[PDB]
Design a protein around this ligand. Sequence first.
Ligand SMILES: Nc1ncnc2c1ncn2[C@@H]1O[C@H](COP(=O)(O)OP(=O)(O)NP(=O)(O)O)[C@@H](O)[C@H]1O
Ligand SMILES: Nc1ncnc2c1ncn2[C@@H]1O[C@H](COP(=O)(O)OP(=O)(O)NP(=O)(O)O)[C@@H](O)[C@H]1O
Ligand SMILES: [Cl-]
Ligand SMILES: [Cl-]
Ligand SMILES: [Cl-]
Ligand SMILES: [Cl-]
Ligand SMILES: [Mg+2]
Ligand SMILES: [Mg+2]
Lengths: 345, 345
Amino acid sequence: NPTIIRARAPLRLGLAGGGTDVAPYADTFGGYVLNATIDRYAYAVIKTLTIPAVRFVSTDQQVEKHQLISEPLELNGTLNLHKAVYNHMIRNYNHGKPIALELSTFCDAPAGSGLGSSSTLVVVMIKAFVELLNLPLDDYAIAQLAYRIERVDCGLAGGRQDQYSATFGGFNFMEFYAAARTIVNPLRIKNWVLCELEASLVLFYTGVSRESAKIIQDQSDNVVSHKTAAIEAMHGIKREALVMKEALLKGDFKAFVASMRLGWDNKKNSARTVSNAHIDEIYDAAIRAGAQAGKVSGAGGGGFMLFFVPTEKRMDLIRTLGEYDGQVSNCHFTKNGTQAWRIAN
Amino acid sequence: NPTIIRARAPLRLGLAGGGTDVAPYADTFGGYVLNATIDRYAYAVIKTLTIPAVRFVSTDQQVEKHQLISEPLELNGTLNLHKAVYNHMIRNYNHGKPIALELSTFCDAPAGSGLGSSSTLVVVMIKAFVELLNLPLDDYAIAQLAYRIERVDCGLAGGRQDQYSATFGGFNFMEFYAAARTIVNPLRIKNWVLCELEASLVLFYTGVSRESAKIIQDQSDNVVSHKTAAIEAMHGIKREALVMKEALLKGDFKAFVASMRLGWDNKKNSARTVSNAHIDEIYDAAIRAGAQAGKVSGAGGGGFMLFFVPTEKRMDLIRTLGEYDGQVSNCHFTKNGTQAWRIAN
Ligand SMILES: Nc1ncnc2c1ncn2[C@@H]1O[C@H](COP(=O)(O)OP(=O)(O)NP(=O)(O)O)[C@@H](O)[C@H]1O
Ligand SMILES: Nc1ncnc2c1ncn2[C@@H]1O[C@H](COP(=O)(O)OP(=O)(O)NP(=O)(O)O)[C@@H](O)[C@H]1O
Ligand SMILES: [Cl-]
Ligand SMILES: [Cl-]
Ligand SMILES: [Cl-]
Ligand SMILES: [Cl-]
Ligand SMILES: [Mg+2]
Ligand SMILES: [Mg+2]
């Protein structure tokens, strides 16, 4: 009787505030991020095995297989996230006795796409074990656990917003404090506002960013080394996230676009590689085609861009982007957080 | 006090049965179609004007402007659908007195994409007038009206499935009879089945089909001219749509894929240009990459293809398709039918 479980968690568009969730900034001044989940998913699958082994498979089809032993798996640099989730679950919920299983992942967008894929993948792996082991972990616990596994257990530097979008789902405004304290504010946005927003957003995939780690390091350095102007850009990122949140609650699209423009300027000034000449060319083309505001979705340097465009200019913008390197798509938001289902047993 | 209304209606994936909804077949034997709406939309906007004129704007940015006169607009071959919707509403709900307004449309996929864009656009224009005039038209009435406007008023040959997906939303199994009698069967599919299905579907945009009219004409000719083998292919299309419907209700994915394979064979045999060498090359590549079944979504000859692929082979299939001409995407279903909202007054 093999058991087969799948879980999924939606990826996310960073709307405002990204950068203020980097460790030194959040811990010192408090960070704010406004984000929203979209119709693209990370997935994890658990299949119990009929042989004494553990198998890990990743999105880019890396594979590791081990013999069933009663010591933690070493985090040797290959598939550390899968191993660390596995180690945590075995130690904390199965009294340290290994379980014969294959843990596999796949994702609707590769890492560096600006959709929060890395942390979303950690979240979905945890969710799959929550279903397999029937664990009483609520959304806060899963998001806090995903954070621990990635940033502490696997020692990976990064932000704090992606764990929460992946778990809770929908539009959320997050407040980040010291000692890993995060408050999630679910935003119940009016239906008309959501329809108007999707009607006015165009996404543009520019390719994989290879700048995220560098951007996060530079943003962290801003605070640690007291780079005054760059810190002030970050305070601007924080301020505009709150402005945007209130604009969405009031259905004030004029304020929404003005806060995105100021936010994008602030984000570019916070780190040298957030934008580059190639990204600025697209941005400028989008503006003269009729977009009113835009930004890179994730840390920066590539991945998805999003543009706000009035409906009368929408098709013009879509045609213009067709002439650049990348893929255009509409933007559809999802309300559901991470979900699991069973296929066998 | 200008009034601004927007409406949207979701586009659709043809899952099974397409072709049996062509006029001679449906009227003679009864047609069946299984389809489901996706996360891509057609839109219409109505703005009342402060000058005595009527303006029409289309998705590909064609524009017509007329003086406010008290006779129906001529269907001269430019923007006939917009004009005919306008004429109908003025004659039937405004006692024949013209209304000064701009009616504009735009769409997340161009015609020939295989997503039912043409009829979906007619539906959304009607919905916008339903909101502007506060009309008591339910979903059946809007779908029957969209059919009348396109196929009778504008004399355009085509199918019957798209008007119903655009209006009702979700997964529907439609039964088509003579005298324009259609029964919509909403399918309440289990959540796990829907998640499993989205996890197993990959979409692939091959470019605009220019075969739809020819395919529909050939399918119609099959019946009118008694082409025995080609009629029998169509009976197979019909049969497999019912099989697929029952497979989705039972969560039987083995039967689902077998009915899609038989359906695709039957569809190709119903009309010479449903597939071609270019489409078959993609299909074959998808199969050897691990897809278990696939098809062209609309009438055929191009547009979106969909593939069912087991989750363990999903990323392999995605990588393989990356090497062909077209765009890959995930498949996310929507439950909502056509919706309208107000921006001013
Ligand atoms: N200095 C660093 N060294 C090594 N890895 C890092 C460093 N900083 C961040 N990372 C990690 O690199 C991984 C890839 O992240 P990234 O390229 O941002 O793709 P993503 O997960 O799609 N998020 P984003 O694209 O920014 O929305 C994440 O797990 C980060 O935690
Ligand atoms: N013989 C014909 N002559 C002129 N127009 C036709 C004929 N047959 C069909 N049409 C119309 O051509 C238009 C374009 O349809 P089509 O290329 O199928 O794009 P679509 O609306 O995206 N549907 P599909 O792509 O098949 O899902 C529709 O309004 C049809 O009604
Ligand atoms: Cl972000
Ligand atoms: Cl952001
Ligand atoms: Cl179809
Ligand atoms: Cl079909
Ligand atoms: Mg990403
Ligand atoms: Mg189409």
